[PDB]
Amino acid sequence: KFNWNKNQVIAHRGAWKKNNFPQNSIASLNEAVKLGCYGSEFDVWMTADHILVVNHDPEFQGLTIEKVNYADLLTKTMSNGEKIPTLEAYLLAGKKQKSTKLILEIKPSLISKERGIEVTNKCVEMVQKLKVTDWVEYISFDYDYCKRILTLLPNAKVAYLKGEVSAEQMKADKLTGVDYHYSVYQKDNWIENAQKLGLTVNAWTVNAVPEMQWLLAHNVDYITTNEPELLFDEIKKAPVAQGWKLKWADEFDNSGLPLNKNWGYDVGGRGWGNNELQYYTDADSANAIVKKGNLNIIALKAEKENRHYTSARLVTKNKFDFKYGRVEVRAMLPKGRGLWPAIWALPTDSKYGSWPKSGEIDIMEHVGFDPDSVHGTVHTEKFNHVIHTQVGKALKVNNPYTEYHIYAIEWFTDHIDFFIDDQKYLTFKNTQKGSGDWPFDQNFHILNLAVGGNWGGKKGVDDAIFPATMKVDYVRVFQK
C-alpha cells in the first residue's frame, strides 16, 4: 500500500524556506512531499472554539489562537494567500499522498495542563476519525501529552522534546523515540545509548553542514531541518552513503584535558627523529586542552628541560588501532613560519620491523613557511623520506588558518586515497611486491604540533607566532 521514503530528512514546518512558502502551511507540506522527505512536521494549537489549527507561535498574526474563535483567525491571510490550516485540513492534504510521513507536534498549552491534555485527546480522535494513524507520528514538549498519546494509542510513534528525562525512563514509559535539540546530544555516547535501548534519535533546529555531518556520522535516525534540500546533498556526500560505518570518534565535547580513554601522550624533547625544537609535555593543560568543542594543541615559546619550546603530541596507540577504513579529521591549522602541525598514523605492533619498514601514513602535514601547501605522504621500507623515495603530494588549501578543513584518508586493501575537502589529490597503490612496497595491516592515529625540525625549521622559527594553537574539531574513523 504505502511507499514510505527511507531518508532521515524531517521537514521542519514543511519546506518553507527555499521557495519562501509560509511556515506550517499547505504549500510547505506539499513542498516536503515533492522533495521526498521521510516526514513533515507541524505544530498544532486549539482555538477557543476547540478547533485544531496549525501554527507555531501561540499568537497567529497578532491573534492569540487559544483565546480567540477560529472564525477570527480567518481574518488573517498568509503570504501565499493561504488561511491558517486546520489540523483536519493538514491531515487531509497529507492523506492524499503515501511517500511522506506526518510528524505532529502538540504545543504545550499556555492556559492549563488540562486544556493541553484535551488537545492531545482531540488530536488522537481526529487522527482516528480520518484513518491516518499510519501517517501521524507524535512529538511534544509536554511529557504528560506523550504519555496520554501512548494511553489512547498503545503503538503510536511518540517522541519527547525536552532533554530532562533520561533515555532509560523514556523506554520505561514506552516512548518510541527521543527528539532533543542537537546540543543535548554532545555528551559521549548519548546518541548510541538511546539507540542501544531501541529508541529512535531525532535532532531539530539543525540548519548547518558541520552539525548535519556530525549527526550523519553517528548515524542518527532523523534530522529535523529548515534546509531539507541542503540535507539531501549532504546525505549523498556523507561517508555513510558509501557504506562507511563509524567505529571510533572523538568530537571533543570533553571540555578539559584529552580523554584518557582515547589519547596517550608522547613525551620527550629528544628531536623525535627530525631534530625538532619542542618538548612534548605530559598531560599539561598549557599544550593540550579541550575547550569549546575543539581540541587545542598549543605550542608555547617556553623553556622545558633542554628545549626552548613546549607543545603536545597525542597518540591513539594501545587505545584504538585499526586496519583499513576511512579516517576523518577536521582541523584549523596554526599560522606561523617554523610550525609543523601533523595528522598522521603509525603502526601499533610494528610487525614488519622498525620504522620505516612497517610504514607510516601522513594524512595531513603542513610547514609554516609555505602557507599554500598541505601535504599527504606515505612512508614505506622501499619509499621513505630518509632515502628520498617517499611518494606524496601537495595541494594548495585556501584559508587554512582561518577556517576548518577536513583532511581524510580512505584506506583499502589495494590502495590509499588522500582527501582534502572531499577532493582526492593522492592515490597510493599496493604494488603487490610485499611489505617493502606496501606495509599496511594495522596503524594508530597521531596528533601533534611540532616546532622547527629538518622540514619545518629550514627557514627558521618566527618566534612571535607563539602561542600557536592547532584546533581540531573532531577525529572520526569509519570502516566498512
Count of other CB atoms within 10 angstroms of residue 422: 9
**Shorter beta-carbon distance to Ca ion: residue 29 or 416:** 29
Q: Which of 366, 186, 210 is nearest to 290 (CA)?
A: 186
**Shorter beta-carbon distance to Ca ion: residue 474 or 478:** 474
The SS3 assignment for 195 reads helix
Q: DSSP assignment of 52-117, as one string?
A: EEE-SSSEETTEESTTS-HHHHTT---TTSPPPPBHHHHHHHHHT-SSSEEEEEEPPPSS-HHHHH
Closest separation in Å from C-beta 102 to Ca ion:
12
Residue nearest Ca ion by beta-carbon distance: 293
**x/- letters, 333..362, toward Ca ion (CB under 5 A):** ------------------------------
DSSP state of 307: B
Closest separation in Å from C-beta 26 to Ca ion:
16
Note whether 58 binds Ca ion by CB under 5 A.
Answer: no
**x/- letters, 250..269, toward Ca ion (CB under 5 A):** -xx-----------------
**x/- letters, 308..327, toward Ca ion (CB under 5 A):** --------------------
CA distance 138 to 149: 8
Task: Tell which residues of the chain come right before a gap with C–N over 2.5 A.
Answer: none
Closest separation in Å from C-beta 197 to Ca ion:
25
Is 118 marked active-site? no
**x/- letters, 461..480, toward Ca ion (CB under 5 A):** ------------xx------
Say which of 227, 234, 328, 360 is annotated catalytic. Answer: 360
* Interface stretch with Ca ion, choices 46-54, 57-65, 128-136, 286-294 (CB under 5 A): 286-294
* Interface stretch with Ca ion, choices 119-127, 190-198, 243-251, 257-265 (CB under 5 A): 243-251
32-51: which residues touch Ca ion (CB under 5 A)? 43
**Shorter beta-carbon distance to Ca ion: residue 7 or 28:** 28
Q: Give the chain's length.
A: 480
Note whether 105 binds Ca ion by CB under 5 A.
Answer: yes
CA distance 222 to 39: 9
**Shorter beta-carbon distance to Ca ion: residue 361 or 472:** 472
Radius of gyration of the chain (CA): 27
Closest separation in Å from C-beta 68 to Ca ion:
21
Say which of 137, 234, 365, 381 is annotated catalytic. Answer: 365
CA distance 124 to 137: 11
CA distance 429 to 438: 8
CA distance 107 to 46: 9
**Shorter beta-carbon distance to Ca ion: residue 218 or 337:** 218
Is 360 marked active-site? yes
447 in Cβ contact with 311 (< 8 Å): no
For residue 218, give every residue at least 6 positions away whose Cβ sits within 8 Å of its Cβ, in sequence order, or none.
185, 191, 192, 246, 249
Backbone conformation region of residue 104, classed left if phi is above 0, alpha if psi is from -120 to 50, else beta: beta
Give the count of residues interacting with Ca ion (CB under 5 A). 7
Note whether 179 binds Ca ion by CB under 5 A.
Answer: no
Among residues 293, 392, 436, 467, the one that binds Ca ion under rule CB under 5 A: 293
Closest separation in Å from C-beta 186 to Ca ion:
7
* Interface stretch with Ca ion, choices 46-54, 150-158, 272-280, 289-297 (CB under 5 A): 289-297
CA distance 218 to 240: 9
138-177: which residues touch Ca ion (CB under 5 A)? none
**Shorter beta-carbon distance to Ca ion: residue 140 or 176:** 140
- List, by residue number, the catalytic residues: 360, 365
Q: Which spans of this chain sit near Ca ion (rule: CB under 5 A)?
A: 43, 105, 251-252, 293, 473-474
